[PDB]
Amino acid sequence: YGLSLMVVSQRPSEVSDTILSQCNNFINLRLTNINDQNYIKNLLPDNSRSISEILPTLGAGECLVVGDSTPIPSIVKLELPNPEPRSQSIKFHKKWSESWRTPSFEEVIMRWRKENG
Amino acid sequence: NLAQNEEVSFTLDGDKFFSKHVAVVGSTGSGKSCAVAKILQNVVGINDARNINKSDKKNSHIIIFDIHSEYKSAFEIDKNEDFNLNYLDVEKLKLPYWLMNSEELETLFIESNEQNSHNQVSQFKRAVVLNKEKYNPEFKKITYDSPVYFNINEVFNYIYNLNEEVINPKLSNGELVENRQIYFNEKLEFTSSNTSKATKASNGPFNGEFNRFLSRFETKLTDKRLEFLLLNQDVEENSKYRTEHFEDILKQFMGYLDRSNVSIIDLSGIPFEVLSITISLISRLIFDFAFHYSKLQHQKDELNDIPFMIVCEEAHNYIPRTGGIEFKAAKKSIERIAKEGRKYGLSLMVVSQRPSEVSDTILSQCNNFINLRLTNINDQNYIKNLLPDNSRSISEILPTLG
Amino acid sequence: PKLSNGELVENRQIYFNEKLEFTSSNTSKATKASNGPFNGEFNRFLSRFETKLTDKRLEFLLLNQDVEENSKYRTEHFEDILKQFMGYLDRSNVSIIDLSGIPFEVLSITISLISRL
Amino acid sequence: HNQVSQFKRAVVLNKEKYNPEFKKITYDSPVYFNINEVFNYIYNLNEEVINKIEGEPSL
Amino acid sequence: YGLSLMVVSQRPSEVSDTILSQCNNFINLRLTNINDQNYIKNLLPDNSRSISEILPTLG
């Protein structure tokens, strides 16, 4: 019905097996968890189980491709996107290097009650 | 300094350490509190019992949930170095009981070691909402979960209408008083059942069914250990805090009242029955403050300027891996600030002695781990499994630590 | 069922419009009344129901139909609702649905809804 | 379940009757509760007969 | 609070693991049941595993 999946997960050992096992191709970047190592080793076909040992040693920007679409497994270097992704996260240390900043402690309490609650 | 070489200075990436949730576990005798105190004094700026930030006060915001009451001297210095500590013990803590959701209120008052009788909970909820609505006319929409001030004693007097003989209006106060709002003001006394008139003169619908509930309730209303909920509203000081005074109780936690970078919340004297409610209330109010503050600044194209730093010393009590219904509210609140709060400016360092007994719904979200020596084998296995990097050099050192 | 004012209700569907007050239990014969099979069994259910309905952070689900003009979305509105997720209105080729602000207890339900649609 | 509930109710009842001064009389309270009256309480519950004669309340 | 344990048993495989795992020091006399020796080996600190092989021989 024109629906296919591609999975992004830091910890493949925690994602449900009922969906990861359905994957045919793989894009394996650097992994540093033995459980992820072994689960990955199990899902990949036997054709790359020998080259799959390189996973803890991939450099920055390099990925290993194993699947049917690629004729044979390969290590592909990925060019940076334009524009680059960036989450507006807060990092606490420089906010802690400034002086005491009192945020007037008034409008937030007004926002607590939307209109009257 | 490095353990192997003591001359090399070892540094981390601070922006990637405190901004993300951290877990601190270990075992007794390794100085886990020692390591926590060292980290805390390094971040806040205590160096050889001297405050480096003398001329100017840095923007450090640690809030501590202390249950042992053994961290006071971690930051208590002489007065001349002007680095004050907001020591919120059981006595000085002021947490109003009317900022308290349905579940917490029901568990505090209604819940008992016996099976509840029918129409007890519903009458309590109706009394609470009616007293809320009576007390504030300005607020438009009032429900059982609206954080508005109300008197618990008036609700008790409403439940005191147990001795109803007037009708299954026929109130036997004066002659035929109609409005029931006077129930809050006074206990009231009614006549006997040996009479009749044009209308019915039989016992009330709730007659003879609250007798057991008032006893437990009034015993709770005169409890000295529970004095930090402002339950005994008869005293003037307990009644001085109102809906317009939500400002004062909020600021005593962030420490802006006395300009304190460290705000110890000492849970020493709070009973084991109301600990979860206190933790959940504090957690909810911190999360709501951060949420509203963050949403406010989005109009100015700016993010949070005042982050917060929550340590949860001996966390294995109130967020257990397995347990009963006692710690539900604390568990859900800590989960709220764990699975989120990185967007709204909140960080958690879950300090526990037993990482194998802490809920994994909060332990899986920690990005950095500070582990000391471990004696229990399953503790070792669980910690090693949780660690993002364990490659033949991290899974072999946990018991060998000194 | 007998109302407080005495009118027997023949159609239970009047409960939909508004809340109704009932009579009291009596052991006599002139005005004998018995509690219903569902009397007082939904108190906690009703409390949690109201708590879910009165939540201000869950406005995307449009749960406060009683006071807000959220009843405007009749079954007829399913067309544009379907087309909004998939970029048919603005001819957007990429369907990114951010879920950062969704509270953590309703994330799974939203993801399930969108995937199923 | 019914036996557990009835036993705890009877113990709490006897504890309250024999200890009026104490307030938080709980099932784990180390106050006096006698077993003969609890056994009699279970005996009479097991043999109780309710009266359903019209007019008077069912006791 | 002022309480500690000095558990004594012939069958460590039968004593619940929730308490034996809390023992910080051990006084180990001769053991001859392999199922008990394996348990006491796994529960011991790592540094003492090498020297722990004397248990069947101690007399």
DSSP calls for B355-382: GGGB-HHHHTT-SEEEE-----HHHHHH
**B225, two tokens:** 């250990």
What lies within 8 Å, CB to CB, of D4 at 6+ separation is none
Q: How far is CA B293 from CA B12, B260, C54, in A?
A: 30, 20, 21
**A29 contacts A9 by C-beta, under 8 angstroms:** no
The C-alpha atoms of residue B338 and residue B342 are separated, in whole angstroms, by 8
Are D26 and B113 in contact (CB < 8 Å)?
yes
Whether the bond between D57 and the residue before it is cis, its omega within 30 degrees of 0, is no
- Residue B220, classed as helix, strand or coil, is helix
Cβ of residue B219 closer than 8 Å to a chain D Cβ: yes
Helix H or strand E encompassing A74: strand A74-77
Show the beta-strand stretches assigned E in B178-271: 262-266
Look at B205 and C40 and tell me if their CB atoms are within 8 Å: no
B252 three-class SS:
helix
Q: Determine the Cα–Cα distance for residues A92 and B39; give it in Å rounded to an integer.
A: 15
| Nearest-angstrom CA–CA distance, B201 and B193 | 7
Task: Name the one residue in this structure whose structure tokens are 């080793």.
Answer: A41
CB atoms B205 and C25 under 8 Å: yes
**Amino acid of residue E57:** T
Tokens representing residue B50 in the block: 């001297």
3 state SS of B51: strand
Locate tokens 């680095």: which residue?
Answer: B83
**What residues in B contact C26, CB-CB < 8 Å?**
168
Q: Which amino acid would we find at residue B262?
A: V
D52 in reach of chain C (CB within 8 A): no
Contact by Cβ (8 Å): B351, B315: yes
Listing from the earlier edge strand, what are the strands of the sheet with A26-28? Answer: A26-28, A62-66, A74-77
Q: Are B38 and A113 in contact (CB under 8 A)?
A: no
Q: Which residues from chain B sit within 8 angstroms of residue C44, using beta carbons? A: 121
**Three-class secondary structure of residue D13 per DSSP:** helix
| DSSP symbol at A69 | S
**Distance (Å) from the alpha carbon of B204 to chain A's nearest alpha carbon:** 34
Is B88 in contact with B75 (CB distance < 8 Å)?
Answer: no
Closest chain B C-alpha to D36 CA, distance in angstroms = 22
Cβ(A21)–Cβ(A43) under 8 Å? yes
Cα–Cα–Cα angle for B155, B158, B163, rounded to 5 degrees: 145
CA dist., res. B339 & res. B20, Å (int): 11
How close, in Å, is residue C12 to chain B by CA atoms? 23
Kindly list the distances between the CA atom of residue B202 and the CA atoms of B205, B286, D58, in Å, as whole numbers in the listed order: 9, 51, 17
Amino acid at B356: S
Collapse the DSSP code of C8 into the 3-class scheme (helix H, G, I; strand E, B; otherwise coil) and give the result: strand
Helix (H) or strand (E) holding B65: strand B62-66
- On whether the CB atoms of residues B51 and B82 are closer than 8 A, the answer is yes
Residue burial B120-149, b: 16+ Cβ < 10 Å; e: rest: bbebbbebbbbbbeebbeebeebbbbbbbb
Instruction: Please tell me which residue of chain E has the smallest CA distance to B373.
Output: E45
Q: Are strands B308-311 and B346-351 parallel, antiparallel or unpaired?
A: parallel
Share in percent of chain D as helix, strand, coil (round to 5): 50, 0, 50
Q: In terms of Cα–Cα distance, which of B63, B86, B87 is closest to B349?
A: B63
DSSP state at residue B326: T
Taking chain C, what is the end-to-end CA distance rounded to the nearest angstrom? 41
- For A6, phi then psi, to 5°, come to -135, 135
Both ends of chain A: CA-CA distance in Å?
A: 48
C34 CB within 8 Å of a chain D CB? no
What is the structure's resolution, reported in angstroms to one decimal? 2.8
CA-wise closest residue to A108 among B292, B236, E3 = B292
Q: Which of D5, D23, D27 is closest, CB to CB, to B115?
A: D5
Instruction: Tell me whether strands A62-66 and A26-28 are parallel, antiparallel or unpaired.
Output: antiparallel
In 10 A of CB A43, how many CB atoms?
A: 16
Residues in chain B with CB shorter than 8 Å from the CB of A33 are 387-390
Rounded Cα distance, B218 and B160, in Å: 10
Q: Which residues pair with B46 in a beta bridge?
A: B51
DSSP letter for A81, please: P
C-alpha atoms less than 13 angstroms from C-alpha of E25 in its C-beta half-sphere: 4
Say how many CA atoms lie within 13 Å of B229 toward its Cβ: 28
Q: Interface partners of E (3+ CB pairs, < 8 Å)?
A: B
- CA B8, CA B12: separation in Å to the nearest integer? 13
Give the single-character DSSP code of A83. S
Q: What is the largest CA-CA distance in chain D?
A: 45
Asked whether the beta carbons of B15 and B360 are under 8 A apart, the reply is no
Give pairs for C33-36: CB < 8 Å, separation 24+: C33/C2, C36/C1
Q: What are B86's strand-pairing partners?
A: B263
Experimental determination approach used: cryo-EM
Residue (of D49, D47, D51, D37) closest to D9 by Cα position:
D37
Tokens 């392999």 locate to E34
A57 in B contact zone (CB under 8 Å): no
SS3 for E8-49 is: CCCCCCCCCHHHHCCCCCCCCCCCCCHHHHHHHHHHCCHHHC
Long-range contacts of A18-25 (CB under 8 A, 24+ apart): A24/A67, A24/A68, A25/A65, A25/A66, A25/A67, A25/A68, A25/A69, A25/A70
- Calpha distance B362→B77 (Å, rounded): 34
Under DSSP, the state recorded for A15 is S
Q: Provide the token pair at A6.
A: 């591609």
Rounded Cα distance between C95 and C90, Å, is 11
Q: Which residue of D12, D23, D24 is in closest CB contact with B114?
A: D12
Strand partners, B66: B266
Contact D57 C27 (CB under 8 A): yes
Instruction: Give the 3-state secondary structure of residue B333.
Output: helix
Under 8 Å between Cβ of B173 and B188: yes
The residue among B112, B114, B202 with the most chain D CBs within 10 A of its CB, best to mutate, is B114
DSSP B146-178: ------HHHHHHHHGGGS--S------STTT--
Tell me the C-alpha distance between C77 and B236, whole Å: 57
Q: Which residue type sits at E49?
A: R
**The two structure tokens encoding residue B24:** 């601190």
Contact B157, B171 (CB under 8 A): no
Enumerate the β-bridge partners of residue B310.
Answer: B63, B348
- C27 and D54 in contact by Cβ < 8 A? no
DSSP state of B110: I
Which chain C residues contact residue D58 at CB under 8 A?
27
Residues 110-129 of B with CB under 8 A from D: 113-115
User: Please, is A23 exposed, middle or buried when counting C-beta atoms within 10 Å of its C-beta (0-12, 13-18, 19+)?
Assistant: middle
For residues B16 and A90, the answer to whether their CB atoms sit within 8 Å is: no
Contact, B22 vs B370, CB < 8 A?
yes
Q: CA B293 to CA A108: how far, in whole Å?
A: 6
- B128 half-sphere exposure, CB direction, 13 A CA radius: 24
User: Among all chains, which residue has been given the structure tokens 């004297």?
Assistant: B269
Q: Minimal Cα–Cα distance from B43 to chain A, Å? A: 9
Tokens of B323: 């347990």
Contact in structure between C29 and D54 (CB atoms under 8 Å): yes
How would DSSP label each residue in B258-304?
A: TT-SEEEEE-SSS-TTSHHHHHHHHHHHHHHHHHHHHHHHGGGT---
* CB of D27 less than 8 A from some CB of B: yes
Beta bridge partners of A74: A65
Alpha carbon of D26: minimum distance to chain B alpha carbons (Å)? 7
Q: What angle do CA C3, C8, C14 make, to 5 degrees?
A: 80
Q: Does C29 touch chain D (CB under 8 A)?
A: yes
B-chain CB neighbours of A31 within 8 Å are: none
Q: Using an 8 Å Cβ cutoff, are A64 and A54 in contact?
A: yes
Q: Which of B126, B235, B237 is nearest to B184 (CA)?
A: B126
Buried (b) or exposed (e) across D13-38, using 16+ Cβ within 10 A?
A: ebbbeeeeeeeebeeebeeebeeeeb
For residues B359 and B316, give the distance between their C-alpha atoms in angstroms, rounded to a whole number. Answer: 8
Spatial separation of the C-alpha atoms in residues E39 and E30, rounded to whole Å: 14
Chains B and D touch (3+ CB pairs under 8 A): yes
Count CB-CB contacts under 10 A for residue B62.
22
| Strand order through the sheet with B85-88 | B85-88, B262-266, B62-66, B308-311, B346-351, B22-25, B368-371
For residue C55, give both structure tokens: 């939540």
Find the residue in B nearest to C35 (Cα).
B118
- Smallest Cβ distance to B58: which of A99, A107, A117? A99
Contacts by B328-332, CB closer than 8 A, 24 or more apart:
B328/B103, B328/B276, B329/B103, B329/B104, B329/B107, B329/B276, B329/B277, B329/B279, B329/B280, B330/B275, B330/B276, B330/B277, B330/B279, B330/B280, B330/B283, B331/B276, B331/B359, B332/B280
| Element holding B311 (H helix, E strand) | strand B308-311
**CA geometry: angle B216, B221, B225, nearest 5 deg:** 105
- Tell me phi and psi for residue B62, to 5 degrees: -100, 135
Report how far residue B289's alpha carbon sits from residue B250's, in angstroms, rounded to the nearest whole number. 9
How far is residue B193's CA from residue B36's CA, in Å, rounded to a whole number? 69
Cβ within 8 Å of B, A 27-56: 32-35, 56
Contact between residue A77 and residue A88 where contact means Cβ atoms under 8 Å apart: no
**Residues B338, B362 contacting (CB under 8 angstroms):** yes
